[PDB]
Design an enzyme around this catalytic site. Sequence first.
Site, PDB file in Angstrom:
ATOM      1  N   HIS C 118      23.752  32.576  74.440  1.00 56.74           N
ATOM      2  CA  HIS C 118      24.802  32.277  73.482  1.00 56.74           C
ATOM      3  C   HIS C 118      25.389  33.609  73.040  1.00 56.74           C
ATOM      4  CE1 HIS C 118      24.769  27.992  72.980  1.00 56.74           C
ATOM      5  NE2 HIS C 118      23.470  27.956  72.746  1.00 56.74           N
ATOM      6  N   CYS C 166      29.476  32.880  75.056  1.00 56.86           N
ATOM      7  CA  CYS C 166      30.651  32.647  74.224  1.00 56.86           C
ATOM      8  C   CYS C 166      30.989  33.931  73.480  1.00 56.86           C
ATOM      9  CB  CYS C 166      30.407  31.508  73.231  1.00 56.86           C
ATOM     10  SG  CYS C 166      30.201  29.895  74.013  1.00 56.86           S
TER      11      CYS C 166
HETATM   12  C1  LIG Z   1      28.420  29.541  73.989  1.00 54.25           C
HETATM   13  O1  LIG Z   1      27.709  30.381  73.459  1.00 54.25           O
HETATM   14  C2  LIG Z   1      27.908  28.758  75.176  1.00 54.25           C
HETATM   15  C3  LIG Z   1      27.868  29.671  76.401  1.00 54.25           C
HETATM   16  C4  LIG Z   1      26.693  29.353  77.301  1.00 54.25           C
HETATM   17  O2  LIG Z   1      26.684  29.857  78.444  1.00 54.25           O
HETATM   18  O3  LIG Z   1      25.775  28.613  76.884  1.00 54.25           O
HETATM   19  N1  LIG Z   1      28.700  27.566  75.449  1.00 54.25           N
HETATM   20  C5  LIG Z   1      28.415  26.366  74.932  1.00 54.25           C
HETATM   21  O4  LIG Z   1      27.537  26.189  74.100  1.00 54.25           O
HETATM   22  C6  LIG Z   1      29.243  25.206  75.425  1.00 54.25           C
HETATM   23  C7  LIG Z   1      28.346  24.058  75.897  1.00 54.25           C
HETATM   24  C8  LIG Z   1      29.098  23.079  76.795  1.00 54.25           C
HETATM   25  C9  LIG Z   1      28.316  21.784  76.996  1.00 54.25           C
HETATM   26  C10 LIG Z   1      29.247  20.628  77.348  1.00 54.25           C
HETATM   27  N2  LIG Z   1      29.475  20.513  78.778  1.00 54.25           N
HETATM   28  C11 LIG Z   1      30.471  19.789  79.297  1.00 54.25           C
HETATM   29  O5  LIG Z   1      30.952  18.834  78.704  1.00 54.25           O
HETATM   30  C12 LIG Z   1      31.013  20.152  80.653  1.00 54.25           C
HETATM   31  C13 LIG Z   1      31.696  19.197  81.411  1.00 54.25           C
HETATM   32  C14 LIG Z   1      32.201  19.526  82.668  1.00 54.25           C
HETATM   33  C15 LIG Z   1      32.029  20.816  83.174  1.00 54.25           C
HETATM   34  O6  LIG Z   1      32.521  21.125  84.419  1.00 54.25           O
HETATM   35  C16 LIG Z   1      33.575  21.977  84.654  1.00 54.25           C
HETATM   36  C17 LIG Z   1      34.316  21.819  85.825  1.00 54.25           C
HETATM   37  N3  LIG Z   1      35.348  22.637  86.084  1.00 54.25           N
HETATM   38  C18 LIG Z   1      35.665  23.618  85.227  1.00 54.25           C
HETATM   39  C19 LIG Z   1      36.729  24.475  85.511  1.00 54.25           C
HETATM   40  C20 LIG Z   1      37.053  25.498  84.621  1.00 54.25           C
HETATM   41  C21 LIG Z   1      36.310  25.664  83.453  1.00 54.25           C
HETATM   42  C22 LIG Z   1      35.245  24.807  83.170  1.00 54.25           C
HETATM   43  C23 LIG Z   1      34.923  23.785  84.060  1.00 54.25           C
HETATM   44  N4  LIG Z   1      33.897  22.959  83.795  1.00 54.25           N
HETATM   45  C24 LIG Z   1      31.338  21.768  82.422  1.00 54.25           C
HETATM   46  C25 LIG Z   1      30.836  21.439  81.163  1.00 54.25           C
HETATM   47  C26 LIG Z   1      30.209  24.723  74.372  1.00 54.25           C
HETATM   48  C27 LIG Z   1      29.874  23.853  73.329  1.00 54.25           C
HETATM   49  C28 LIG Z   1      31.053  23.467  72.634  1.00 54.25           C
HETATM   50  C29 LIG Z   1      32.163  24.075  73.078  1.00 54.25           C
HETATM   51  S1  LIG Z   1      31.856  25.169  74.332  1.00 54.25           S
END
Ligand SMILES: *C(=O)[C@H](CC(=O)O)NC(=O)[C@@H](CCCCNC(=O)c1ccc(Oc2cnc3ccccc3n2)cc1)c1cccs1
EC number: 3.4.22.36
Lengths: 88, 88, 178, 178
Positions: C118, C166
């Site tokens: 994170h 992030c």
């Molecule tokens: C932040 O500190 C962290 C970084 C980390 O590496 O952990 N991020 C978060 O905590 C995210 C968690 C996201 C979990 C939810 N996942 C999804 O819903 C999801 C759905 C589809 C998916 O696939 C794709 C496919 N193609 C893409 C193309 C471009 C970009 C992304 C793509 N994703 C992926 C994930 C967060 C929690 C809240 C907001 S961000």
Amino acid sequence: AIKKAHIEKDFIAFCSSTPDNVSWRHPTMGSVFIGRLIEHMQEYACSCDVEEIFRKVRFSFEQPDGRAQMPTTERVTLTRCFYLFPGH
Amino acid sequence: AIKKAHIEKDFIAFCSSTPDNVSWRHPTMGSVFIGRLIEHMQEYACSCDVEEIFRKVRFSFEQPDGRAQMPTTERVTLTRCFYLFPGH
Amino acid sequence: NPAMPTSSGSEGNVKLCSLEEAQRIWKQKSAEIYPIMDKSSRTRLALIICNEEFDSIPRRTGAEVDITGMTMLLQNLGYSVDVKKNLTASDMTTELEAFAHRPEHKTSDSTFLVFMSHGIREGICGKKHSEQVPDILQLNAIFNMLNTKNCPSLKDKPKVIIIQACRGDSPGVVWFKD
Amino acid sequence: NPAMPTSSGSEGNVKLCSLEEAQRIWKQKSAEIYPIMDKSSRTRLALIICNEEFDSIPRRTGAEVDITGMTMLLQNLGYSVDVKKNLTASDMTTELEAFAHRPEHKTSDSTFLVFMSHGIREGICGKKHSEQVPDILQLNAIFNMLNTKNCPSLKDKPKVIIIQACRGDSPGVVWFKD
Ligand SMILES: *C(=O)[C@H](CC(=O)O)NC(=O)[C@@H](CCCCNC(=O)c1ccc(Oc2cnc3ccccc3n2)cc1)c1cccs1
Ligand SMILES: *C(=O)[C@H](CC(=O)O)NC(=O)[C@@H](CCCCNC(=O)c1ccc(Oc2cnc3ccccc3n2)cc1)c1cccs1
């Protein structure tokens, strides 16, 4: 119809030195980074993209004399090559 | 005999997103930036330098869907092209 | 070389650079390429730090996939990979300092550093991170620990830092009309 | 084209790219180059902010040479150049906001921003800067003011920022023995 765009994209920064460090300037000749940037832009704008030119500028500073500095490229979100195409 | 060297040189950082912004990850598929980086490294390490490969990774993110991010290259002091020459 | 390419070798899924291509790159660019050490004697090192289980912030489910992918890739590229998991910012610093002191860098031509956690605007989160008591490793510290002063063995050698994290709360988008 | 190249033209000392070279670059790279607008209709803009005379910190003697060189170069490259001198961080912000609002960016394909001043670790010094009362413009603010949100006219267009400034007190060197 509305569409999504990246908030930050297609940027490139070029700084005269690395963080924490001084950048040099001559009272009659000007700043070394600026002079070197101009010379490299004059020579290589025709054949190289801006990222490549900046790298060449960095390379010209590689060997340190009495005074040294290392120009740094920062926060790059150029998704493509930026060619100046001088004359066009 | 002692000689002078740049304190900071030959660095490249590659971050998953731009400042202020989130980076995405899938519970079974992993992080999109990591997956995309591997795929591009697998394909282009043979023909492109690391800076070029990172740019290609950025380009693959250009068109934003429902979720978007823009990987950023940071604090670059690579004075030369870094080719991996895979197999050698 | 085999008629059909195979992933059974040390380079796995990484496309091979031929001798014709290697000499072409050696010719297209003069003295503007980083030198590579002999494959027989070089001791390439890479480090992966990945935080998945946290005390106070959400679990980074799927991180194991990233670890597997990055470890296998860096190995394919010729690097011996260290994998360290669930560390505080203090632990990350101690591990980075130890990595910078590794004898193998002297007989190496490059290094890869990979951080996956994170993150906030200021930097990368440690395992004990919370809003009340921050546990952050700054990108600035990473560079400092690996520079010519603190890591003389990697002088003149490419140091590649990859960060999955992030960098704030925002979705990274704005609307426009065509 | 003349037998011998001349600096009397609009591009001055900048080496010209021929039509053979331009098509070669168009061929060597497919769809990975930024598009350039027609020379007849485009309105390229560039901005130079240079601080030489300061209230409390040493005079940046020789800055006039930098201004002359950078202005002439950006013009050679096809940019209409604004030159602003001796500004506070507040003045720099107001000027940057105005630049981002310029109508010409809509019919432009790119922009150059040039900052030349004293600097510290945190950013670039304004004219009124002192240790007691800091007058600093952060690099972060520059990016924010020129991004897609605050400058929609430059969406998808290369934005090149050049900074001549110190970034701290240190000489940037370490000793080693051969
Ligand atoms: C932040 O500190 C962290 C970084 C980390 O590496 O952990 N991020 C978060 O905590 C995210 C968690 C996201 C979990 C939810 N996942 C999804 O819903 C999801 C759905 C589809 C998916 O696939 C794709 C496919 N193609 C893409 C193309 C471009 C970009 C992304 C793509 N994703 C992926 C994930 C967060 C929690 C809240 C907001 S961000
Ligand atoms: C910091 O904020 C500013 C940045 C600025 O752009 O103003 N820097 C300083 O204030 C400098 C001022 C330096 C004045 C002293 N000048 C010189 O003595 C001098 C001598 C020779 C010279 O030429 C060359 C030639 N070749 C070079 C190759 C590589 C690098 C530099 C080279 N310089 C230039 C200048 C500082 C004041 C104290 C420390 S830094």
